[PDB]
């Protein structure tokens, strides 16, 4: 009688009756918030896969009162690396599991049991493996307990040797030395190697309380027979069993898969279901496609959590509604979730997305169908995006809208030419109406074609950079002109335009012979900075030809300086006449490390020592809130005024060209 896949008994103490017939509990067992008010005893139960949890059970004095024959807790799935949790159990006096033999996986958590004795009387080192990670705190103090086994055997705990027992009447059962890793019957006759725990009969597959590997047809097999597959982690089932198993109900819930001789819930990472919902997984090349299916026909992306549900999807069976008013780093965060979406079965609506200046986060999206379209047969519908400068329609990208039209309205920063280039790749030239794309309220503030600002001279220090660009006469004589310098620390050159950019506004100088420049204040020595200037053309006469000026992203690295001292010098001696020494690279290298230079000087044997008469002494010497980081910083600042130019006891000098060890 297998019970599962999870027993959760709580509140009602009579609800414990669900264990009348269970001999094995497939899955965890929860006995919580029970208030006992005749007793209940379950000698049928012997094995529990996964873990066992007990919490706030009043009236229960010993665990032997419930599960006396419990032998193996497999711990296939653990409660936070714990296979047995006994927490806040009142009236409990001892762990009465006197038939417990092997806990295959996980640790034990025994906490807050003011009456729990017989803890030190149990040698947990022979029933489980990871005894180091066990948690036994807050129980009855051993000083005020009084553990006394009836009157059995005993063994060594640390350097101590004391008796072992589970309760006041039963002792801790052990196996003789001759069986080794094997198991033993109550009468100390070795159990079949594939057995585990006890035996109904010595050396027999069909006489086992619990198998150590797997189970099938009453036999403890090492591996499952050829036509059976591993289910959970203890028994073998046939193929027709897993064709009837159904996972937890979800939007895309399906049956179980057969893979690598195991019957699991979903195909593992790097695998996809062969065919159409078949029982077997096939290796998928590179990235494995995850089609995402949702109950809501129109998924609305109005926050950052809503986008997390589309993480890793390749195809979307539904409609996408983007509505992003707020968000700083969402331009790169949406690309994490939606960057792999390639096909959309429905339509895409970009409404009120003021935070989006572009749609580049929708990478790999190359197909939009039109199974359902907005009123008026629209498959692409943007509206009221006060900052949408460009689409994701770079001339490198690919796109195909199968059916539907495109409507654009109230997008002022979007150049009207960009959406004409869209329907080229989209393939909907002439399919839209005359009002679907209008130059009114669209591209009103757009500055499409821009000029080029040319840098003229750059000068570098260890912390300052002077850069000057050419004077820029605006396209119209009456425009007021000003500049804006964008500079930010960029370790490498792949940089996106404005974002943690530092900005400063410098005006065009009055004298026409001097060109506009800017001086940067405090920069890190030897650090590559990305700089580009942008013009501010305030046109008194609006539109006609809105024309800005933008420069290329210039990468300027400051000079190098004196490096920092090496960090944490440690040294040891593995042999006489030899000294190993390791360290860490300095805090502020300020350039390429190139090499280290180490020096070792012999130290004189201590003064005096030769002088004292050590036959009179009794001991002769031998030899082998927290702002302290700011304190140590002061002493590192002192080491800048003194450097080292390389070339009684003499110094020996050697160069280490690569590693931090010598």
């Amino acid at each position: 009688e297998i019970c599962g896949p999870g027993i959760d008994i709580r509140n009602d103490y009579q609800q414990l009756k669900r264990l009348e017939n269970c001999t094995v509990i497939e899955g965890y067992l929860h006995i919580l918030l029970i208030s006992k008010a005749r007793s209940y005893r379950f000698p049928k139960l012997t094995v529990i896969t996964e873990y066992l949890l007990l919490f706030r059970v009043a009236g229960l004095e010993s665990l032997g009162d419930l599960f006396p024959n419990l032998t193996v807790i497999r711990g296939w799935k653990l409660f936070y690396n714990y296979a047995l949790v006994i927490f806040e159990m009142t009236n409990l006096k001892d762990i009465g599991l006197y038939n417990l033999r092997n806990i295959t996986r996980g640790a034990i958590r025994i906490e807050k049991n003011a009456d729990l004795c017989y803890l030190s009387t149990v040698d947990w080192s022979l029933i489980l493996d990871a005894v180091s990670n066990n948690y036994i705190v807050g129980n009855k103090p051993p000083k005020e307990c009084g553990d006394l086994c009836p009157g059995c055997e005993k063994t060594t705990i640390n350097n101590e040797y004391n008796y072992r027992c589970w309760t006041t009447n039963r002792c801790q059962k052990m196996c003789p030395s001759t069986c080794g890793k094997r198991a033993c019957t109550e009468n100390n006759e070795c159990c079949h190697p594939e057995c585990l725990g006890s035996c109904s009969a010595p050396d027999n597959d069909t006489a086992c309380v619990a198998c150590r590997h797997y189970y099938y047809a009453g036999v403890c097999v090492p591996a499952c027979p050829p036509n059976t597959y591993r289910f959970e982690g203890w028994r073998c089932v046939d193929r027709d069993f897993c064709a009837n198993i159904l996972s937890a109900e979800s939007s895309d819930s399906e049956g179980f898969v057969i893979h690598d001789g195991e019957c699991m819930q979903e195909c593992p990472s790097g695998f996809i279901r062969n065919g159409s919902q078949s029982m077997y997984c096939i290796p998928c090349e590179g990235p494995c496609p995850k089609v995402c299916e949702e109950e809501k026909k129109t998924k609305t992306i109005d926050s950052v959590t809503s986008a997390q549900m589309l993480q890793g999807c390749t195809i979307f069976k539904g409609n996408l509604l983007i509505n992003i008013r707020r968000g700083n780093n969402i331009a790169s965060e949406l690309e994490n979730f939606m960057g792999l979406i390639e096909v959309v079965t429905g339509y895409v609506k970009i409404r009120h997305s003021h935070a989006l200046v572009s749609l580049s986060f929708l990478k790999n999206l190359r197909l939009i169908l039109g199974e359902e379209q907005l009123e008026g047969n629209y498959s692409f519908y943007v509206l009221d995006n006060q900052n949408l400068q460009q689409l994701w329609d770079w001339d490198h990208r690919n796109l195909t809208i199968k059916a539907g039209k495109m409507y654009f309205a109230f997008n002022p920063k979007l150049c009207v030419s960009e959406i004409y280039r869209m329907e080229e790749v989209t393939g909907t030239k002439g399919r839209q109406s005359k009002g679907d794309i209008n130059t009114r309220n669209n591209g009103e503030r757009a500055s499409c074609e821009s000029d080029v600002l040319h840098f003229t001279s750059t000068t570098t220090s260890k912390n300052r950079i002077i850069i000057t660009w050419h004077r820029y006469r605006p396209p119209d004589y009456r425009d007021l002109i000003s500049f804006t310098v964008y500079y930010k620390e960029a370790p490498f050159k792949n940089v996106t335009e404005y974002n943690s950019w530092n900005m400063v506004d410098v005006d065009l100088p009055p004298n026409k012979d001097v060109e506009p420049g800017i001086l940067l204040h405090g920069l890190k020595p030897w650090t590559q900075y990305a700089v580009y200037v942008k013009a501010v053309t305030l046109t008194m006469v609006e539109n006609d030809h809105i024309r800005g000026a933008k420069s290329e992203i210039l990468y300027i690295r400051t000079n190098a300086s004196v490096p920092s001292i090496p960090l944490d010098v440690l040294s040891a001696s593995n042999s006489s006449s030899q000294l190993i020494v390791k360290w860490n690279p300095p805090s502020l290298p300020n350039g390429n490390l190139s090499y280290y230079i180490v020096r070792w000087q012999r130290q004189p044997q201590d003064g005096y020592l030769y002088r004292h008469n050590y036959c009179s002494k009794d001991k002769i010497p031998i030899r082998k809130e927290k702002e302290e980081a700011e304190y140590r910083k002061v002493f590192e600042n002192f080491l800048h005024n003194s450097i080292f130019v390389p070339r009684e006891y003499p110094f020996f000098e050697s160069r280490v060209d690569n590693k931090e060890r010598t």
Partner: antibody
Amino acid sequence: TQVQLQQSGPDVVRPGVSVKISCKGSGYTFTDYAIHWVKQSHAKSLEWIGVISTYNGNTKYNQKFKGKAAITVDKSSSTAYLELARLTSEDSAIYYCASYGDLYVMDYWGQGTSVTVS
Amino acid sequence: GDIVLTQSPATLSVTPGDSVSLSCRASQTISNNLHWYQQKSHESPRLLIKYASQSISGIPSRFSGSGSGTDFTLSINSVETEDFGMYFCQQSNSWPRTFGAGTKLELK
């Protein structure tokens, strides 16, 4: 083989009432096979409405019947149940119990339960 | 969306002894995940053909399935006086499970 599925008797109930249909398994391991439910009316003909896995207890419904049907199981009694609330004249049909197969095929079928909404 | 199974013709007037073939076409491609069922009058539908082609132990040799992909056919070599009923095809590759409208095999 001795496999058989016995469903509850016919029902004639007024509109707006809730009803549930039983289906007891026999001659086979009840926990080893899922149970499907199929609605056969005069219109739409055979309509699959849901399947329940007898092992774990999880279900999968047809979206046309999620807010209308509810499939439960009884491991001890070896019986599944198909609950139907706010019955309409449309739901007046014969419902069938199917098992001894898998989530893909319905090998054996029960005799059917006639629900008539007056 | 769902998968609709269109069974044509809706009714076949046959005399016992004639060989007939039923057809069940699908909207999307089903490859192999199609099954057949026979339902006589005042009975429950019983399985005839698993997975488009392979037959069931018990059903006579007259019933045979064919097709793979989007067009499937059920053949009956010499209809008997017992084979007069209504036949369905069952979709089985994508949720939800859907059936065909049904093809009545009545007496001509």
